[PDB]
Amino acid sequence: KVFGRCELAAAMKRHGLDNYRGYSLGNWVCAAKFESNFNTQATNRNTDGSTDYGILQINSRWWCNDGRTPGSRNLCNIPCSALLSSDITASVNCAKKIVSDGMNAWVAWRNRCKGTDVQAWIRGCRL
Amino acid sequence: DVQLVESGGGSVQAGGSLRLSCAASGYIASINYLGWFRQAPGKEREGVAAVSPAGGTPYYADSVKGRFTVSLDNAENTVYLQMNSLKPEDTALYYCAAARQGWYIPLNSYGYNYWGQGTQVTVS
Numbered sequence: 001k002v003f004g005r006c007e008l009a010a011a012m013k014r015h016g017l018d019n020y021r022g023y024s025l026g027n028w029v030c031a032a033k034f035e036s037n038f039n040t041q042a043t044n045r046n047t048d049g050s051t052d053y054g055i056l057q058i059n060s061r062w063w064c065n066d067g068r069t070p071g072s073r074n075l076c077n078i079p080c081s082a083l084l085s086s087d088i089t090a091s092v093n094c095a096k097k098i099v100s101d102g103m104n105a106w107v108a109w110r111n112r113c114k115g116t117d118v119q120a121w122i123r124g125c126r127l
Numbered sequence: 128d129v130q131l132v133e134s135g136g137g138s139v140q141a142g143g144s145l146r147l148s149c150a151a152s153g154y155i156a157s158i159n160y161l162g163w164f165r166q167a168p169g170k171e172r173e174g175v176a177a178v179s180p181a182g183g184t185p186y187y188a189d190s191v192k193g194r195f196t197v198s199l200d201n202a203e204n205t206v207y208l209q210m211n212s213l214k215p216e217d218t219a220l221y222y223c224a225a226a227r228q229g230w231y232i233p234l235n236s237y238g239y240n241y242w243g244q245g246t247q248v249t250v251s
Contacts, residue, residue: 043228064229066229066231066238067230067235067237079229079230079239080238081228084228086154
């Protein structure tokens with residue numbers, strides 16, 4: 001599933017991401033935009049053997065276990081496959097963990113969102 | 128987004144055979160592995176067999192490999208478990224499960240995201 005910006009904004013809001021850890025909703029939508037272009041099925045394999053999964057491109061070395069990544073911490077305590085769900089719940093719950101333990105974790109966020117009017121990402125949306 | 132419905136279970140005599148079927152419906156394209164997990168009463172579950180729909184590669188628990196065969200019918204999004212030379216040790220609840228991409232240990236239930244109700248298989 002490739003989310004629409006607003007649909008994702010609404011879903012993220014529904015998942016309490018708005019101002020989660022002080023990060024306004026647009027941060028998360030923006031992060032998702034640049035991480036996966038809102039594609040819940042996005043996967044990016046890294047040379048380190050880890051893979052970034054889902055709408056928030058959560059890495060399998062630290063956050064989820066995909067069973068093929070060495071040094072798997074699985075801090076989100078989830079199989080990476082959970083991150084490929086069409087609903088964003090697992091990704092959001094993990095993202096909440098990632099941000100709990102700053103959104104810089106998403107190089108994409110720090111680089112394409114941080115420092116911009118991230119709230120622009122939730123404008124026009126029925127929230 | 129995926130529903131798994133098993134059927135084909137039942138009680139058979141040692142040496143007998145049963146063919147479990149698991150029909151997947153829904154977002155079948157999101158399935159990377161369709162597997163069978165079994166669990167005896169009060170015992171830990173065990174990955175029995177799994178197959179990746181796209182490439183058809185099958186995986187088997189050593190205890191059933193060369194005995195059981197798993198087959199996938201992508202046309203019907205149904206995975207089957209041909210249980211040949213059944214033994215008492217095969218008695219258990221057999222669960223169909225589907226794992227999306229992101230889980231690469233076929234016989235490890237951890238990354239399976241969808242589960243069937245589990246069909247009982249009893250071997251006497």
